[PDB]
Design a protein around this ligand. Structure first.
Ligand SMILES: N=C(N)c1cc(-c2ccccc2)c(-c2cn(CCN)cn2)s1
Ligand SMILES: N=C(N)c1cc(-c2ccccc2)c(-c2cn(CCN)cn2)s1
Ligand SMILES: [Cl-]
Ligand SMILES: [Cl-]
Ligand SMILES: [Mg+2]
Ligand SMILES: [Mg+2]
Ligand SMILES: [Mg+2]
Ligand SMILES: [Mg+2]
Lengths: 12, 230, 230, 12
């Protein structure tokens, strides 16, 4: 899936 | 709690060590133990709590998506579904744990805007992660729980924080993603991201070099999303 | 075992799913369950077992080194030592688990060279990981346990496998690292790596394109180490 | 620590 930017660690 | 016998300060110290070692499950357990001491958290401690659980749930979300995608192709034995469910249940457990800490009793003791907005944003975030995997008769209520938490956080942040405040910015970023792909409100998402970006732009002139760096980092994430959405 | 009620084939299927999801703790638990069914493992299944535990212990080793380094600087409260010990004990537990599977009863039922060398190499590897963290009166015996397993594997591999065999190559690679930094025998390490590389070179002409790729990949690791060592 | 090459996943 295309994941959009969210706050904090890009841990997924 | 298995951390009941360890000093608060030792738990915080070990959370920082666990972060350095990329041991995020340990980091989260240490910070859960620190929360359960019952004292309010400092800014640094709140960020340790958030970083820990964000890393844990992030691994679970990425794994869930791989299995959710492979399961969808398989549809267009029980093992793919079973294992997706296993990961899903673990993920829901982590979200419930975080939400439990926020409800007992981090939010109710948080009176300053910087703590209260931080925690309400987290509450929105972990209901959003629950929403990502929700399919049953409670999906609408999970989504509304996320919305409600984000909205309360937004209302406080607009009254009590400048538009460049990084907590306010990260809240708006995440609420805009909530709109785009959880609430199926892409226009609301785009509007929120644009307004947030523009009002922050206009307030950068008030900031020191260090605060400028903090704020523009999150502004770039808003821009990244707007570029994909428009 | 918590996997006692799951079909062998379902455990293998879920190990492969867990690998795709980068869920290596799950992958290792599934493969442990498959081993405990009591049947011998196929080549693919042996590799699933090894990949799973290598990823788990690799995370622990990396974390242990970060904490072991921070602890050494601190020397050049009890918390750093305590947390290094915690990770160390977990790491030792994983090694003991793997060694337990090899001893009950993977090695004793392994009669073909490809299975027996694979398992004896693993036994050497997990005693080597124990040796990396060993400091007490058993360190010498742990090191000799690693050496003994590697040596038996080497003796079989030289009699029963061609010099390009990837299992033989990976064994020699790991035994050479054992020599270099566990046995404090850098000259033995260099000799073994060089001889292994050169004898494999001379046998590449017998291989198909696919086997050539498999063998030269590991040969490059021997070369990588020789470049750092000489 | 400088880690040398060993077989399989470079997981540390
Ligand atoms: N251990 C970590 N990951 C972190 C520690 C801290 C930290 C916070 C206060 C004092 C010292 C360190 C972090 C922080 C702070 N803010 C807000 C400024 N925009 C963002 N992140 S993050
Ligand atoms: N799921 C994984 N990571 C792996 C699966 C297999 C595999 C083995 C046999 C048949 C089909 C797949 C692996 C393998 C095989 N060999 C030996 C050839 N040099 C090296 N690796 S590895
Ligand atoms: Cl399962
Ligand atoms: Cl500890
Ligand atoms: Mg479910
Ligand atoms: Mg539009
Ligand atoms: Mg110890
Ligand atoms: Mg020399």
């Amino acid at each position: 899936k295309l994941m959009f930017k969210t706050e904090g660690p890009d841990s997924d | 709690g298995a951390m009941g016998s360890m000093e608060r300060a030792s738990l915080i110290q070990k959370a920082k060590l666990a972060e350095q070692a990329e041991r995020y499950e340990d980091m989260a357990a240490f910070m859960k133990g620190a929360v359960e001491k019952g004292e309010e958290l400092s800014c640094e401690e709140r960020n340790l709590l958030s970083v820990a659980y964000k890393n844990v749930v992030g691994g679970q979300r990425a794994a869930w998506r791989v299995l959710s995608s492979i399961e969808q192709k398989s549809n267009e034995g029980p093992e793919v579904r079973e294992y997706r469910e296993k990961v899903e249940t673990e993920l829901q457990g982590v979200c419930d744990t975080v939400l439990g800490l926020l409800d007992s009793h981090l939010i109710k003791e948080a009176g300053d805007a910087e703590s209260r907005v931080f925690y309400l944003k987290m509450k929105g975030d972990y209901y959003r992660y629950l929403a990502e995997v929700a399919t049953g008769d409670d999906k609408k209520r999970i989504i509304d729980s996320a919305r409600s938490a984000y909205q309360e956080a937004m209302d406080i942040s607009k009254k009590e924080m400048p538009p460049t405040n990084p907590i306010r910015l990260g809240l708006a970023l995440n609420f805009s993603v909530f709109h785009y792909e959880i609430a199926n409100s892409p226009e609301e998402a785009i509007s929120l991201a644009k307004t947030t970006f523009d009002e922050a732009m206009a307030d950068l002139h008030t900031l020191s070099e260090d605060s400028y760096k903090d704020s523009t980092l999150i502004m770039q994430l808003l821009r990244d999303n707007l570029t994909l959405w428009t």
